[PDB]
Each structure stands twice: as C-alpha cells, then as structure tokens.
Automatic annotation (TrEMBL), chain C:
The species this protein was found in: Streptococcus phage CHPC1156
Biased amino acid composition, Polar residues: 1-10
Biased composition (Basic residues): 12-21
Name of this protein: Uncharacterized protein
Residue ranges of the region described as Disordered: 1-21
Length: 434, 49, 105, 434, 434, 434, 145
C-alpha cells in the first residue's frame, strides 16, 4: 500500500539548458512522487559531487545518463520494497550503497533525486502537504526572502567585486506583502536602469547585471529603486550582499585582491582592511546580510569578522561551510559566522540537510535554504524552509519561473496555513541582537 | 545465495509409479499421486552366507 | 508463473516484518557482499542487478502463493489451472511380481 | 465521485514578476487539478481580455484579485456539482455565464484557469495522462519545436526590424535528439557571442538579444552556431522568423517602415517590396517559417504572400488570426497564410482552442501551440500539442524554466509513449509541398 | 484491474448469413468488451485480407474457424497481460505478431475484432462513452449521412451502370431531423415505386433495386420522392452517387464501357468523355458527392476529374485509395480526389484507421466512415465517426438494423452530448469551396 | 446498490425505418439495462396496444414521443426507488398505474421497454447472464429454429395464399449445426431462384418472396433447396407453414377464400375442405408445423383441426390466441391447437409473457417465442426462449441482423453453456406422439 | 470472490435418529451454504443409492462416514476452483467423477449434499432468496399441501 514498487529516473533539462535528472517513485497503492535535481558541481574536494557523463559528443560532456542508469539499475533494486514513509532508512540505505564520502560512485544528484521523490511520494500517500510531512504539525513560519536584484563579480562585466546584491523585505506584515514589495522594487529598478540607459536583461537568477561605477553606486541605485517603489530603506527593505570573496582572494599573498573585477587601479585589501571595508559598508548603507565576506580558508579572518560585525549583521558561510556538518561544527566551535547557506544537492540527502539545519539552529545560527544557478520547476526547498521554520530563504529574483516557482509555492503554503501562518521578518534574524 | 534455511529442503525426484506384490498384498512405493520419489532411498536385507 | 499469484497474507507479512529493509547482496558467484561492493560490481557490469539480492526471510510458515482467477466465457470467475489440469489418467501403474521378498516388521 | 466539490482561485506570479491567477479543482473522490494562466493582453478588438484590478497602488495596476474573486464567488457556485469529465459542458456554462463576446465580465484568465484545472482534475480522476484525456487514444506525435534564439524589434536595441529568430531541428530522429541539438546550438551561439563581445543575458523568451548589424548578421550568426554545433543547415536545422510586421507598419502610408527599428537608413517597402524581401531572404537562407510576415490588416498583402511563398515556406498568422475562429475562417476563404498560432488564453477555453486547432487541420493549415511572454510552471500546452497531434510547438528558448518546463513535459510524454512515439520533423509541415 | 486477462473468440453470422467472428475481452477487474467484424474480402493486392476456412463442405468455404483459432490460441497468449488502455501498443504488438503487410497470417478480421474488443473493454473500464475514449473530450460533431435510396450496377438488373444512389440531408438542423427526413423520403419513394408497379424488396444495403430506365430516371424519381416528402432538393436534401467505375472499366481499351450494365446501345466513354458526363450530371441534378467516378488505377483521369469537379463536388475514392496510407499519400501528392472512404476492416486496426483519418484531414480531405456489404449489430463505426469529428458517414439505408443499429447509436450519441452536439450539415463538406 | 435511480426513454428507429422507443435503467451502483421494443399494433380488440403520436407531419403518424413522455414523466417517477430485482413488483405497479386492460393509457411499448430494461439492469447488477436471471440455474435447452425461407399471401405478389413457409432443421446435433444447415439451405435456394430468373431481394423477415406458380411449387422449390444443400427432407430438415388464414377468410359465408391471393381460378374451401387441404399437404410433404390454419374466430374449425391433425403435426395459434391468457385457457379447455405463438410486445410485460409460457407448458402446448415484423438489434427473445426451455424460436430468415442478432445471441448462449447445452430438435415437439 | 474455496462434510443425525451427512460450502468472499441430505434407501434397482458404512458396531450399520470421506477427499478437490453459480457444471462434473449410473461409487447422498450446499452458497453470494436463484424471476406459486 505504502510499499515502493517503482523507482525510475529520466534525463531532463535544468534552467540553463544543461542536462539534469528527475526521479519518479510509485508505491503499491498508486501514490506518486517526482523529484527534480538542481544542477550543482561535479568536482569538489569536500562537497558532494554529481555524476556527469563526460562524453563530449552529447551535451558538451554534461549528460546525466550515468546517474540515470545508477538510479534505474542500482538504487531501484535496493529501494523497491521499502516503505515510502521510511525516509531516513531509504536515505541511509542509499548512503551505504554509495559507500564514499563525496557520493561520487552513485552521484549526489541521483541520491538527492531519489530522496526528494520518496519524500513527495510519502506526502502524497499520507494526503498531507509536503511541509507537514517533513516538519510535523508545528510548521507555520513563512521565510523572509533575499531577493537578488543586482549582479556583479564574475556574473558581470561591471567593475564590482561583489557577486550579488539582494533586497530583504523584512518589514512586511505577511509573505504576500513581502513578495509584492519585492516585485515592485524589481520593476522600479528596471525603470531606473532603462532611464539610465543600462542593460535590463536578466541573468541566471533573474537579476540585472548593469554597468555600474562600483559597489557603492549599485547600493545607491538599489536604495533609489526602493524609495521609488514607496518603501523606507532600513525600516521596510534592507540590503544584503554576497561578496563571494573566494573568487578575488589571493591565497599566496593572503590579500583580497579587488583588482580582478574592478580594473588595475582597484584598492588591494588585506584581511583587516576587508574587515573595516565591510564595516564602512554596513555603517553607510542599511545592510543586514553579508555572505562569503571572507575566503573559504581564511578562518582567522572569519573569526575577526564575526567578532567585529556578528552582533548586528548576519554573516552567511556558503562556501565557508558548503552544507557540511563537520565544517559547521568547526565554525560553531571557533565562533566563525552566524549563518549557514543550506543547499540540498551539496550534501545530497534530505536527512542530512535537516541534520545540518538542526545543528545550525541549535547553535544560534540561522539556516538559509538556497537555490542553485541551474534550477528546475521543482519547488521542494520552499517546503523545506517552511518545514524547518528556518525563517529565511534565498531563491533568486522576481524574473524567471525557476525562481518564481518557489515564491508561488510559498504563497500556496501561506494560503493553506491561513490564520496560523506567521511572517516574522526581522524576528527571523534571531542570530542578531535586538 | 542458495542459503540453507532451517534444516533445508526435501529432495524428491520424479519417476513412474510402481506397485509391488508382497504377502501383505499390493504396496505402492510412494503415497502421493504427483509421482514423487524420495531420491536416493533404498532398502536392503543382509544374510550370513 | 501465471496460474498462481502472491498471497495477500504473505505480502502483509513481508510488508510489516520489514524484510525488504534488510536485503542481502551477492556477486556473480553467489557470495554475500556488502551493498557498496554490490553497487560497484553492478555499475562495472560484473554483477547482474536483477538476480543478486534477497529479501531477508519471513517467519511463520505462511503460504507464499494463492491461486489466480480469470473470467470464463459467461462472465463467471474460475481458477486458472483448475479446468486445464489434466485430460488423461496417464495409464499406469505396473504391478511387479515380488512375492519372494522378506519384509521387515 | 467525479462530481466537482471545490473550485478555488488564488493570485500567484508569472515569469515576469507580474501577477496572474491559478485555479484548483477538487472532486468528491479527491481528484485534484490545478490550472495556472499565462499572462495575456487586457486590450483587444476581437481577442479575449483578461481582468486586471487597475489599482495603481498594488502591483502597478496588474493585480488579479478581481478575477480570483470572480472564480471564488461566481464561477465556483456555478461549476460545483458538475461532473469533472464534462469539459465541454463546463466551458459552455462558463461562456454563457460571462455573456460577453470577449469574456470581459468574468475575465478570460479566470475562465481559462477553471478550464485547465477541470481538465487536469478529470485526467487525475481517470488516472490517465492529460494528453490521453484531451486527445483520445491515438495521441503519438511529438511536436517539432521552433526554438527562439535571437531577438529584435521591440525586444532589442539592435537595428533588426524582425521581432525574433528561431531554429527548427526538423531533421532529428526523436524529440530527445531535437532538444539536444537545440541546446547544443544554443550553447555554441552563446560561445560565439562571448567571442564577439556581444551581450549574453537572456530576454523574456530565454533568447539572446545581441547588438547585431542587421537581419542578415543575425541569420548568419545563427548558421555559424548551427555549423559549430556540428549540424547541417537546411538538412538538420532550419531557420524561422517572427517578423511581427504590425510593429513597423505605417497604416496611413500603407508601407512597412523598417526605419522604426533599423535606423534612418532603412528601406521603406510597400507590400510587393516586402514580399520580395521575404522571398529573397527565403532564397538566401534555409528559412522554413515566416510568422506575421505582413500586417494583421493587410489582407491583400497576406494573399499575395501566400500566392508567392505559400508553397515552400510556412506562413503563420499570429496577430492575423489572434486565435479567432471568425478570422481563421475568413483567412481560409481567401487563401491567406497556411498556419495559425494557437494561444490558449487568446480565446479563453480548451474547447474553443481545440475547435480552432481542428478547423485549421481540416483546412490544411498547421496549428502551432504557442507560449506567452509571461509564462508559468504550468506545462499544459505540451499536452495540448501532443493530444491534437499538431506536430509543431513554439514554447521559447532553452534558457528559462518557464520554457524548459514544456520541453521537460514533452520529454516525459515521449518517454511514456515509448515505441509508439512519433517525431515527424519535416513531415510535420504538411501544409507545404515536398 | 485493467490488465487483459481473457480473450475469447467465436464464430457468428453477418447480415448476409455468411460467417464472421466476434471477440470478447475481459480485464482483471471485470471490464468487458465485445467486437464484431464486418464481412470483408480475402483477396486484394494492397488491402488487408481476412482469413477463411476454405472448407467447401462448411458454409461454402466461408467459415471463420481458422481466425477464431488464431485469436484463441495465438493472439490471446500475446495480448493477455497488456493494459487494456494500451490500444496503440496492443495493435502494434498484433501487427508484429502477424508479420505480414496485408495481415494474411493471423487474419485482418481477427486483428480488427481484437482491436475493437480491446477499445470497448477500455471504454467500459474507464466508464466513459466509446467516442470519448476514442477521440477525447472534444467529440461533438454528428456526421451527415449519405444514405442509400436506389441501387443499380451489379446489385440490380435495371439498365443503370452506377452502383448506388444516396440522399444527403445536409440542410437539416439536427441529426434527429436528418434521420426523420431520410426515413420519410425512403417511405415516399417506396410509395412511388409501389404506384409505378416496380419492386419493393430491399437488397444487401437496405435500399431498393427497382427496374428503372436509366440513371436519369432514377435520379428524377429520387428528386420526385424528396419533393413528395416535402423537402427542397438542392437546399434541404442533395443527391450522391457511387459509380463504382472499376466494374465497367475496360483496362485493355482504356475506356468506360456502359454496355456491361446499360444494355447494347449504351454509350462508350473515354476518361474525358466520362468527366464530361459526370459534369453534365452535376449541372443537371443536385449531386454533391460522387464516389469511384474513375477506375482504381486511372490516376490521370482522377486528377483531371478533381481539376474539373473538385471545387464544387466531393469526390470520394473507395477502390481508388482502398483506405491505404500509401495510396492516400500518392493521391494527396498528385491532387487526386478530395475525400477518402474509410473502411475499418480493409486496414484491420483502429490505430491505423485513425491514422488514415487524421492524415486525410491534414490534407483537406474528408474521411467518410463506411459500412460493408455484410454488417453486424455492432455499431462502432458510428462512435468512430463522432470521435474523429469526421462529419460524414455512409452506413446504409433505412430498412435493416445492420444500418439502423448505427443510426440508433448516432441518435444515442446526440442525446448524450446534449446542448454540445453539433450537426454541421452542409458545412461538413470542408473539402469544397465557400 | 440495486435501487433504481434513473429511468429514461428515447425514440429510435426500428428495422423498417418506423419509430419505436428504447428505455435505459440505471441503478445507484452503476448497473445498466437497455430495453428496445419491437413494433406491434396500436389497435386490437383483445391485444395490448402501443401508443403512436398520430401526427401525420412527423414519421407519417407513427412517432413514439407520446410513449417516451409516458416513460419519462409518468412511469419513471413511480418506478424510481424500486429494487431492480423486483421484476414482478415493478411490472404489477406499471400495470396498475396504466389501469386499462389493453395497456392503452401508457402504451404497451412503454411498459415492455421498462420491463426489459429493468430485467437487463437486474441481470447486469447480479453479474449473471440474462437467461440465468430470467429462468434460473436450470437453463440449457437451445430452441429449434423455424426459419422463414419463402413468403406469400399479403407479403408477395405470387398466387400463394399461405403467408410463409419455414425450414425446421430438427435433425441437427447442435444449434450451431442447425444454424449452419439453415444458412446453407438459404444460399442453395438463393442460387436456385437466381438460375430460375425469380426475385432475390429479401422481405421484412429476411426471406425470399418470388413469383411462384403456387403453394405446391413453393414447397417443391424449398425441398429441392434442402436436397441441393445436402440434407434429407423429413429426417434432417422439415417444412412448416404459416397460413395466416384469417387474412383470406370470408366471415360472411363462413368460407376460406383462396381467390383473394391465388387468383380467380383458385378453389374456395369451406372449413372441412380446408381441413382436407391441410391434411393432404401434410401427407404429401414433410410438414411438421402449421400456424394459423383456421380463422381467429373459427373455434369449431380449430377443434376439428386439432382432432384430426393434432396428433402428428404442430398447430400454432398466432392470431387465435394473441398471447392472451384468457384465449389460451379457453383453447386448452376445448382442445383448440396444441401450440401458442408468444409475442412479448403483444402482451406487455415479461411477467405475463412467462405466465403464458408456463400455462402453455402445463397443458402440453408448445410455446414458440416469435419475432415481430419490425424488430431491433435487441435480442431479448433469444434469452426468453432459452430461459423458459421453450425449445422453439421463430426469429426469421438468415439475411438481416434484425433476425441474425437473435441467432447470434443463441450462438453466444450455446457457447457460454458449453457441455451442458442441449439441442432437443425433434424432441422439442413434446406435444406430438413418438 | 464467488469461487468455491472450501467444501466440508460432517456426519449428523436425521429425524429417525439415524445418521446422515451435511455439506458446507464456502466461497472466496465468505458466502456460505449448508445442505443436509434426507435419508433414503441404500438398495435400489434403477434408483440412486446412498453410501452406508455397513459396520454394525456403529449406528447399526447406518453410519455415513464413507460418504463424508468421499466428499472431503474426492469431491472437494474436484469442485474447489469452480464458480459457486455454476450449478449445472458442478453437478455434471460430480456425476462424471462418480461414473456410475446409480451414483453408487461416491454415494447419491454425498452428491446431493454438495449440490444443495453449492446452490445455497450461490444464493447467499447473490444475496437473493433460494427460490429466486433456482427458478428465476417468475416464482410466485405457493404449493397446495
């Protein structure tokens, strides 16, 4: 009745046109679940790796027929016969079947697809919402979104070192209002850029990549767009940054080289110079979030950043932790950062994702469920964010359906919850004082 | 893969049913109608020649 | 196997004794192997994934199998093998004359 | 059991940040269907209009709460109690309840959402795929896609008067291969534009809008991308155009003024000179499709273009027919075009969409199921194209999930169809000779 | 529960007393479907051949025990285990099992019977009408009947070369009214024939075969009967012809010899003279359809006839196309005829019948679903005609239930469709102009 | 689950193109039954009368919309809520609601349609064959068919006063062989009439009506057809007559006027001379059945005929008894005939039909289930004949599915019964000695 | 669900205090039928004979253990698998399995018990009265005693 009778993978396309895989699970009574995998990275020293074909003839070496075969011939034989509600048993069986720490034999994408499909099939069988199945009965908090609105760094030709700029509508009463505010600020920025003569077309996450003068100009034009939409910066809408300083960090010189993205004459900043540069940015602008402000291997710099700015600004480790329990435990021990960016395919299993979220929550850290550059129509991360009561999500801009799907799913979850649903806004930044 | 479970299985070959004429009358070699002989079974009588 | 099907009692027994949660895996020579090496052999092609695993053991001597039914020409139900079971009495047996045989009490 | 029990609409967001609505339908046995509406146009002489709030303080006047209330308080009380498999009866009841030729009282978006939700709920109740329910048992033909790859006109600042360019992989053996060819040509074009220094960010349809020199420059770069990917133009991959000549048509002077997009040096052509330009483009490049080659009101020009080029190239009427049975019949009478662009929200219901498709098929025309600029995660138009065996689909580029969702649905449909799946390619162009 | 578990076949009688076979299919849940095969021909170069016993002692060699044994012993083992809704898969499997282009091994009659039984069992399992299962949700068009009124040629001893004369009530508002008009015209013609002293007994198709003077006298009597019933010829009721020109075509002399049926001083007409005679008949009388006006191998004459009369008269190819896909391709390419007569037992499969119907529709041809000379009480062709929205049927006269069965099935379908049901009438001749 | 939920009637054509009605009964579990009424008579002193519209502008006054309205608006309200298995209660309720002894208020056709639809829906609900439902578990006797092979009297222009002649293949081992013999004799007679230059087109019952020289010529042609088929008359195949002697009976002079049909040179026979004529015909030919040998009101002549010929030949009362229980009881009282022709629409219900059959059986009489002139595709009378083990059926010739449908249903019943099926043949005439 | 799955006979007593046998038939869905056989004559020329033990140590030779064993070991395996509504087929199969014109091999009492039990279980399965199942819809006449 709830016994898994069919596990079947097929190769589909992600949001960039690159191959990914999807897994369908059928149980004995006819309950059905479909899990679609976001595109991650096939190479990684301490992150889960996805299995790619490497055949240059098909899809530029990016085919997923090998992971599809691993699901159909290896995972399917082991998992068929399990109870669909045995999420932890199925996930541990897949982890044991893979046998490697990085999930390189089966492919992390294969394991994640089977995990998501099993969870959705169990929720379908129980006739309950996915967030109810994943997080229990006390699932009520709607996440505060970090809407990526301006792109720089390696995603732009502009002389901006910071990879992403985001708006956080934490002053809205409900998630519906927060989404409306973000859409209106997005359109006001579109109009401002069109008047300024800058590029309006969107990128991977739906955000703009104009030709700004620098980071300061981008933050000022974001604030101008917020004020043009009719909202108060620093009270209703805040600014977040994804610096991704590991891209412009000189490891051998131990210096954050800003000249990589901002021309030859850009200031070259050491660790403490980066610290007080970020402090000056925080004091000048209504910045609530800074992500990857230090290199993934600059532990002393991360500790100095948390000592300096951790009390008032959320410091997210994306590349610092890479959704790894060991790295998060190490960062908690050394008081490095106060937030972790959670990506499901970086660890490859729903059980381990929830373990990382719980470990982050127990230490006073905030877990931010995040999207990948290549996404799908699958909106499971919205259900994960509501299920864990994380209170913060990062699923992209207000442009492409790969991002709008999660916002629509969150709207549906809020409508289903009704009067029980809570949008906490600034109260979801519990890692910060006051 | 061919695991011995509990005390194993019974070995029963198939061979034509045969009646024998003995002093007690007519004796069927096997008691079933699916023609199942207990493979390897035999009887003996030992004398002191 | 068309005349018979899996019994519902055995299916329920297997379902909530969780015997499919404790599979054993084998290589091509029928020797027990860990799931990691089984996966590695199946991926490499050295193991057939279909006939190389077992679903533990169900206790209690339950009948594993029940007769399967079909529809006769008038829409009535009937066991699949009941009516085509046999047509001739196979002739037989042979009455071997063995009066000279010392029986044992 | 199949009696409709609940009809509920809510407001969600489309693939542009603008609001749209989705409708959920529940029957007595628990069968569930969801229909999301692509964003259309609220202004149209003889095309169905969508209902927008007009409140400038909410979403810039684009809110859809009026249509949501129309479904929740008007349509729901009328449809609840119907059998879910009565699609024609439900659609006729909704059309009568509107009582307006362009569905302005209830909104065409509301009616289309209820139609899609009811059809999907009926497919869910019968446990059949949506294409099987919609089109019957003999549904096997996977459509030939016209993948938009280059933009122009009002979608670009380049001096290209044509609205967009498409690649048609009509030489592929399967739809899977055609999708792989389109993806590889897309990535090859991205690499070529990177070498030339042109822009890489995608537009609304997912296609690039670089700063080309002209129409011939764009077509030649498309051919270069096709050859770089490893495919033969004119035998494997063909080229289509959407001119959208209604944008640069001067109604008073009866001329096609390219100066609106190609600068002061552009040629101002009459109908005959425009037909000559299209014919010489067809003779110069492997062009198999021309969409909106003439103005929507230039019937003499359309007739002359069909007499000249209609034997060897496909002439699609997008703004010519606006998914209208009266206009399509008038065009069939006067031998204008040989194809119609079928937009499901330009007419309002699934019954009327299928009536337009079957009328075009009976007239020897091809029906091309099309997307809208603002799309959703809904992928019903894929099931419409497969169900009607139309053999052609226009569902955008290979760069956004609003477009990739339809391609993934077509991949799924091909996988379930299996050995009976048919990809005809060039034989799908049955409106052409040889 | 939808898995086919039982396939039985048995030998029954057709409408002429010759044997045929019927097939019954039972699924696991008890869904039942019965298919009855019309009596076709076991000879033909490029048509599907039925299988007969050949035992001259039994039924004059017309027994069907061999085909029944094929269904019971060969087809049944291959088909049992399939899903009953896998009609395309079952049909392809049976075509592969035959392994012969004309289905001579298993028998076309056996294959068609199993196809019909499977389709009807699938419709029973889904609890939907047969036309809904066959053609989807958009099945509303009630076919216009061309019903036989007067016979000649090889079915009568009168000096009339043309095989059949039909009335087409295309001016009727509904199918019910069209049926009433046809029955009343039939009875009025019966009264006229009784007054004239001619014969009243009906033939194989249910129509009269009286001893007239010629073609013109027969058409004049038909028009007189139409006016006697109270309907305007050429506005309410039209005439149609089935010439069967192959029966009086001399291949050696390449001439149409009317002396075979019309006497000794009968006119002998070439292809051009035959075209002139048919055009004169069309100008003289309200003839709207002509069937087999040329020989089955006279492609040049067919092309010239379609050039001359193809704009105003529907030209049906029965022996011309033999409902063969290849012949229909050649005819569409060569502009020969504008309509095809669709007989389901000349193909042997519902899938291929529907393929031929949609292929003909895509070219602007009309598919006229037709009966055979020896029919049954089965009325699946009515559901086929409604399912494809073909809009034309040719199912016989008004005097035997081998035709009245199909007429009553169409009455039931029109009753079930309710307000949705449409009788296009004169509009169903979409192969004509204006 | 067996409660009647819907009763609905509609107007459909019969086998002669005249209207009739059919009823559909639905129970709440989905069981479905359909009863289609043969065309009887709307007049008659002691026969149940059907309801016709009488509107000469619709179907020549033969419409059945009045009885359809009677079913829909009167009968259905009373019947809905009854158990579908309560056939006797439903029939008695309908008889009481009608009130008139001739079923004239509601129409005998309406009552019969509802009775047959209820019986078939009850058989469908119980998942049993209809003959098993009607007659119980002990239902095995296949009727001995009496095929009408030659017509006469009012059905022919030949100088034959007898209304028709029949072949009775009572020497066959099975019903399948009896039907095969009847078909072969029919085809041999067709060949003989073709070689002799006589007519071939069949009449209402599917038999020939050629221009014979007389009764002796017709019986001789039938016997030569039997011998040409390869069967011995008087051992394998027997002759039967239906004189319809009430048609040419002159009540003024109490004489049987053969000059009405056989011309002025025919002999006019009194009651005793008619006796000797029938007796000499019996001695000359292998005649086992004579139907309507005397007038419907010649009770003394009927008694004399039973006294003299009633020991060796079967004397059927068709118009003598008009399936009336009162007339049958009166005939049993004074030994008039030894067989009754049962016509289900001539009495009105299935309850009264079975009552008349059992009363005939109890007196040694033979009950012959007979077709009406206007039949349908309904084959309920075959199930009635098998259910009562009547051993005789009269359902026309071997040439129209109105007649072949009953034989096909008998073939289906025989094949379903299998080994237990019995064909008595000559033993079915249990009213005759030896 | 209407397939006979269990046929079981047991020895009971009749009116006179003499043994007889009764047969219970169970189908797949739980439909139940019980037929009890009247006591007849074990000797007869052209009359069906019943089976008696003939052991004077039990019931004066009137015991019905032999017919009970015949039902339990012979008829039961032959009948299980049939549809309970196939009365004629079951009766013909039992008559053929006996192979004796007087039904002396299995016993006429055993065959009648199985026949009545099958009819009653078929009536129970169809949820209809026994007379309705046996005689069809047109059963109305109450007999004159």
């Amino acid at each position: 009745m709830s016994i898994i009778t069919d596990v079947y993978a097929r190769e589909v396309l992600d949001s960039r046109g690159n191959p990914t895989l999807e897994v369908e699970v059928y149980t004995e009574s006819g309950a059905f679940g479909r899990g679609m995998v976001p595109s991650g990275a096939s190479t990684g020293e301490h992150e889960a790796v996805e299995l790619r074909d490497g055949d240059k003839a098909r899809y530029g070496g990016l085919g997923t027929q090998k992971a599809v075969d691993n699901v159909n011939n290896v995972i399917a034989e082991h998992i068929i016969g399990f109870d669909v509600r045995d999420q932890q048993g199925i996930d541990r069986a897949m982890i044991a079947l893979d046998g490697t720490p990085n999930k390189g034999k089966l492919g992390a994408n294969a394991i994640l697809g089977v995990s998501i499909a099993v969870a959705r099939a169990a929720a379908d069988y129980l006739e309950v919402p996915l967030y109810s199945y994943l997080g229990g009965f006390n699932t009520k908090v709607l996440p505060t979104p970090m809407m990526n609105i301006i792109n720089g760094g390696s995603h732009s030709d502009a002389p901006i070192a910071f990879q992403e700029f985001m708006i956080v509508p934490a002053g809205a009463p409900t998630f519906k209002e927060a989404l409306r505010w973000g859409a209106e600020i997005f359109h006001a920025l579109k109009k401002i850029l069109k008047e300024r003569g800058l590029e309006t077309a969107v990128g991977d996450e739906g955000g703009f990549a104009p030709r700004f003068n620098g980071t300061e100009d981008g933050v000022e034009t974001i604030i101008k767009a917020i004020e043009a939409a009719g909202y108060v910066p620093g009270k209703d809408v805040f600014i977040g940054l994804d610096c991704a300083s590991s891209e412009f960090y000189d490891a051998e010189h131990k210096v954050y080289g800003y000249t990589k993205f901002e021309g030859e004459g850009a200031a070259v900043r050491t660790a403490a110079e980066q610290i007080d540069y970020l402090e000056e940015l925080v004091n000048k602008y209504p910045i609530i979030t800074i992500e990857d402000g230090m290199d993934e291997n600059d532990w002393d710099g991360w500790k100095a950043l948390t000592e300096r700015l951790g009390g008032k600004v959320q410091l997210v480790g994306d590349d610092f932790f890479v959704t790894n329990t060991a790295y998060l435990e190490k960062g908690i021990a050394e008081h490095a950062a106060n937030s972790i960016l959670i990506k499901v395919n970086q660890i490859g299993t729903l059980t381990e994702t929830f373990d990382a979220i719980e470990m982050a929550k127990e230490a006073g850290y905030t877990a931010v469920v995040s999207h990948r550059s290549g996404e799908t129509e699958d909106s499971t991360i919205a259900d994960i964010a509501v299920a864990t009561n994380a209170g913060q999500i990062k699923t992209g801009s207000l442009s492409r359906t790969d991002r709008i799907a999660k916002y629509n799913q969150l709207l549906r979850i809020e409508d289903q919850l009704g009067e029980v649903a809570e949008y906490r806004g600034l109260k979801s930044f519990y890692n910060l004082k006051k | 893969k061919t695991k011995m479970v509990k005390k194993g299985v019974l070995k029963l070959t198939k061979a034509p049913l045969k009646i024998v004429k003995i002093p007690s009358g007519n004796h069927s070699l096997i008691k079933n109608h699916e023609s199942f002989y207990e493979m390897g079974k035999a009887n003996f009588m030992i004398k002191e020649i | 196997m068309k005349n018979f099907k899996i019994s519902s009692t055995y299916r329920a027994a297997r379902k909530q004794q969780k015997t499919a949660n404790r599979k054993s895996f084998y290589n091509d020579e029928g020797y027990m192997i860990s799931p990691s090496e089984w996966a590695d052999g199946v991926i490499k092609g050295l193991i057939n994934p279909k006939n190389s695993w077992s679903n533990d053991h169900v206790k209690g001597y339950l009948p594993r199998v029940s007769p399967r039914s079909h529809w006769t020409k008038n829409g009535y139900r009937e066991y699949l093998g009941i009516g085509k079971s046999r047509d001739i009495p196979e002739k037989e047996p042979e009455v071997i004359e063995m009066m000279d045989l010392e029986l044992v009490v």
